[PDB]
Amino acid sequence: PQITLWKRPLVTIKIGGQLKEALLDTGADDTVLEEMNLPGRWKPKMIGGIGGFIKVRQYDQILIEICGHKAIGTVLVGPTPVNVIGRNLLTQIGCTLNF
């Protein structure tokens, strides 16, 4: 689809079999979701945002469907204020900016 930006570009995603709402975020290198239960192993990591660094659980090679488009990649889970889909997954679904 073509998504204008008068509202937050929020979309439904499916991860771990569960539906959630997330923000298409071209300013995020990575995908960071609010704390949730996901199956499989994970590794601790640090990520920095506008206000500082937080601790997250890094899940590699995770199946995630974004607005009807499938991706398999890295998902960070931690105390983010907002579920954000970052460029690591936006590239997988073929997302570009256009003006």
Ligand X SMILES: CCOP(=O)(COc1ccc(C[C@H](NC(=O)O[C@H]2CO[C@H]3OCC[C@H]32)[C@H](O)CN(CC(C)C)S(=O)(=O)c2ccc([C@H](C)O)cc2)cc1)OCC
Catalytically annotated residues? 25
Who's near 44: CB < 8 A, 6+ residues apart?
Answer: 55, 56, 57, 58
Q: Which of 11, 32, 75, 90 binds ligand X (CB under 6 A)?
A: 32
- Which of 41, 99 has the CB closer to its own copies? 99
Contacting ligand X within 45-84 (CB under 6 A):
47-53, 76, 81-82, 84
Using CB under 8 A as the binding rule, whether residue 87 contacts its own copies is answered as yes
Using CB under 8 A as the binding rule, whether residue 51 contacts its own copies is answered as yes
The CA radius of gyration of the chain, in Å to the nearest whole number, is 13
CA distance 26 to 28: 5
**Residue 68 beta carbon to ligand X: minimum distance, rounded to whole angstroms:** 22
Residue type, 64: I
